[PDB]
């Protein structure tokens, strides 16, 4: 909710260095503020929540300083870390020196706890359309941190001063920009810190910043219970599951597998290792998967291993239903792992053609077929301009119609063709599709429509590359096909009759049971419904 400033009054050292894994210029100091140190552990905190949803929004932080604001972005384009970082670090960029600024809490103490769920104007959607929520909010946050300083009350002075300053100017109590006026709350917090040193730090010390918030602490070792026990219950009860795999084939690397596979199924960990190859059949389509949210998000096999993995395929070395041992992939926003087949799916010896078309697809040369870049240019955009103008319309119904008229069916393969298979097929969409259309292409297509029926056995100058001798009916089939030129969706290529004269052919126990019996009944006769005095006239039409 609220974070204290970066006052250098209290400081402590944990001997934190860079852990090298492999085995002249000045070196920048590793000095960091207490607020920065507390914020730096928030990445591991989000790992527990990442199991529920890996593609959801992240959590930022704000503090009281010269740039005392709760400015945050919730737009789709701003959802990434590229744009939201500049708003969370508005109090000052990283520069090692003595900064006298932002020490005073009088810079501003209004709109303080509005940096975890408040919306901004960067998006054109509403609160309901975004995520809404009531008291229980998935985007809500609290204050939990385990750092080292002189004392927990050192950072409370700035918060107390800010609270006093805010209370001193409470005239505009019923005025706010967009968010609610926070008055009081209670915050439940947990204890977790990185391993590496003994417990030479506070064990049951709690820090309070305002009279409203007063946390309590207890003695609970991190890692052994915080990660090995809490995460197990936090994963299985959040519609997810975790698996155990080898970290370094021969920092723990954890794979991801759903409980559906386990349901449908019925001291160093050993796992197989394999390297990717350009030509190898070992990757398939993953029908199911799970999101990997391990605590060791910065382990050794995270960047170097994925360096030689840009092809996107995986390699599995089965012993002698193949089962994978480990997988590594970076999706940009979250790390995900996939498991092998578990249900009755044909994965081994699947329906692979392994012959014919699919590999030799070069009928559409890129020499002059690039004219489709205009008619089928509808693609997603990440950064718009100030304004747009030209020949266009709203992207609600015009785009779909334009794409349907332009790229509904654009297949091009030499496996089989009997409609446009002609030596004069140059008038196809590769060059015919243009903004400035001409009737010459239409006339050429109309001529080729009759030409294909006229001649079909000869080979074109371009490289072409029920018993036998059935080619006699091929001419009749071509003539029949040419008749249907003005059919389907070919208005420009439609031809009625051009040169057909030369060589082309022509064509209460008694209550309940009674109610039960009457309830299940059948439709009534029309005459009985229309009857009068239990009698009806027959043959009324006469």
């Amino acid at each position: 909710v609220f974070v204290v400033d970066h006052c250098p009054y209290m400081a402590e050292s944990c001997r934190q260095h860079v852990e090298f894994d492999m085995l002249i210029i000045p070196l920048a100091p590793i000095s960091k503020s207490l607020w920065t140190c507390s914020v730096e552990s928030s990445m591991e905190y989000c790992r527990i929540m990442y199991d529920i949803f890996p593609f959801k929004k992240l959590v930022n932080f704000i503090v009281s300083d010269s740039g005392a604001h709760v400015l945050n972005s919730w737009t789709q384009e701003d959802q990434n870390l590229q744009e939201l970082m500049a708003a969370l670090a508005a109090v000052g960029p990283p520069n090692p020196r003595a900064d006298p600024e932002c020490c005073s809490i009088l810079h501003g103490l209004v709109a303080a706890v509005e940096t975890l769920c408040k919306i901004t104007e960067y998006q054109h959607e509403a609160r309901t359309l975004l995520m809404e929520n009531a008291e229980r909010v998935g985007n809500r946050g609290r204050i939990i941190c385990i750092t080292n300083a002189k004392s927990d009350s050192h950072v409370r002075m700035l918060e107390d001063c800010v609270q006093e300053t805010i209370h001193e100017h409470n005239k505009l109590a019923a005025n706010s920009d967009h968010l609610m006026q926070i008055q009081k709350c209670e915050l439940v917090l947990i204890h977790t810190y990185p391993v590496g040193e003994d417990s030479l730090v506070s064990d049951r010390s709690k820090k309070e910043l305002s009279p409203v918030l007063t946390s309590e602490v207890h003695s609970v070792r991190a890692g052994r219970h915080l990660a090995t026990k809490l995460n197990i219950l936090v994963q299985q009860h959040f519609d997810l599951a975790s698996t155990t795999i080898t970290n370094i084939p021969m920092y723990d690397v954890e794979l991801l597998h759903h409980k559906d596979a386990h349901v449908d199924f019925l001291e160093t960990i050993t796992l197989k290792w394999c390297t990717p190859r350009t030509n190898n059949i070992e990757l398939h389509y993953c029908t199911g998967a799970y999101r990997i949210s391990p605590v060791d998000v910065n382990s050794r096999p995270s960047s170097c291993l994925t360096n030689f993995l840009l092809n996107g395929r995986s390699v599995l070395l089965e012993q002698p239903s193949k089962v994978i041992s480990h997988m590594l992939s970076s999706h940009g926003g979250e790390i995900f792992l996939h498991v092998l087949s578990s249900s009755r799916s044909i994965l081994e010896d699947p329906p692979s053609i392994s012959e014919g078309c699919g590999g030799r697809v070069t009928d559409y040369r890129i020499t002059d077929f690039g004219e489709f870049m205009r008619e089928n240019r509808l693609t997603p955009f990440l950064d718009p301009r100030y304004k747009i103008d030209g020949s266009l319309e709203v992207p609600l119904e015009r785009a779909k119609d334009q794409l349907e008229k332009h790229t509904r069916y654009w297949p091009m393969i030499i496996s089989q063709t009997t409609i446009f298979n002609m030596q004069a097929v140059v008038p196809l969409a590769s060059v015919i599709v243009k903004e400035s259309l001409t009737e010459e292409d239409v006339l050429n297509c109309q001529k080729t429509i009759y030409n294909l029926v006229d001649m079909e056995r000869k080979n074109d100058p371009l490289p072409i590359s029920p018993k036998r001798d059935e080619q006699y009916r091929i001419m009749w089939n071509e003539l029949e096909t040419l008749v249907r030129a003005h059919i389907n969706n070919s208005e420009k290529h439609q031809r009625v009759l051009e040169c057909l004269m030369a060589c082309r052919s022509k064509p209460s126990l008694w209550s309940n049971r009674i109610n039960t019996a009457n309830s299940r009944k059948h439709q009534e006769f029309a005459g009985r419904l229309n009857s009068v005095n239990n009698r009806a006239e027959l043959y009324q039409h006469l």
């Binding site: 299940r520 009944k521 059948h522 439709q523 029309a526 005459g527 006469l542």
Partner: protein, 148 residues
């Protein structure tokens, strides 16, 4: 809990016997005869009483024929094929054997001795015989789950 009986044929006359019985939501037709002497539009029973311009199979679950006389089974092919009743028709084995020939004789009479603009044909008589289920003497058949 009522038994509703509506004889729309042979109520107070002899001929065109066709009686509707609704006993427990099971609507059965007790005969499908035809009248003799009437020239047109009254030979066959009034089937508009059973919500005409609709499927009769939904309304009726069983059609029963007593014997092969024309005043008890004469309108059967017209009824079934023309008005579209594809449900079961129950009749004894001799009734099944002797019914179509009587219909064929009357069809010959209608096409030769009279007009036949609104009458049925031999193929349409044979089409009706397909839906027939023969029932033996004292054979308690189960036409439905509860109706026997």
């Amino acid at each position: 809990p009522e038994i509703r009986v509506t004889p729309l044929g042979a109520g107070q006359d002899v001929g065109r016997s066709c009686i509707l019985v609704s006993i427990a939501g099971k609507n059965v037709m007790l005969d499908c005869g035809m009248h003799m002497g009437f020239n047109d539009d009254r030979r066959f029973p009034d089937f508009s009483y059973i919500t005409q311009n609709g499927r009769l199979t939904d309304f009726l679950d069983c059609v029963i024929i007593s014997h092969f006389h024309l005043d008890h089974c004469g309108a059967l092919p017209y009824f079934s094929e023309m008005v579209g009743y594809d449900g079961p028709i129950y009749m004894t084995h001799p009734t099944q054997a002797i019914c179509p020939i009587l219909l064929e004789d009357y069809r010959k009479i209608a096409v030769d001795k009279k007009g036949e603009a609104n009458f049925f044909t031999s193929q349409m008589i044979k089409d009706c015989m397909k839906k027939v289920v023969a029932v033996h003497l004292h054979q308690t058949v189960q036409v439905d789950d509860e109706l026997e």
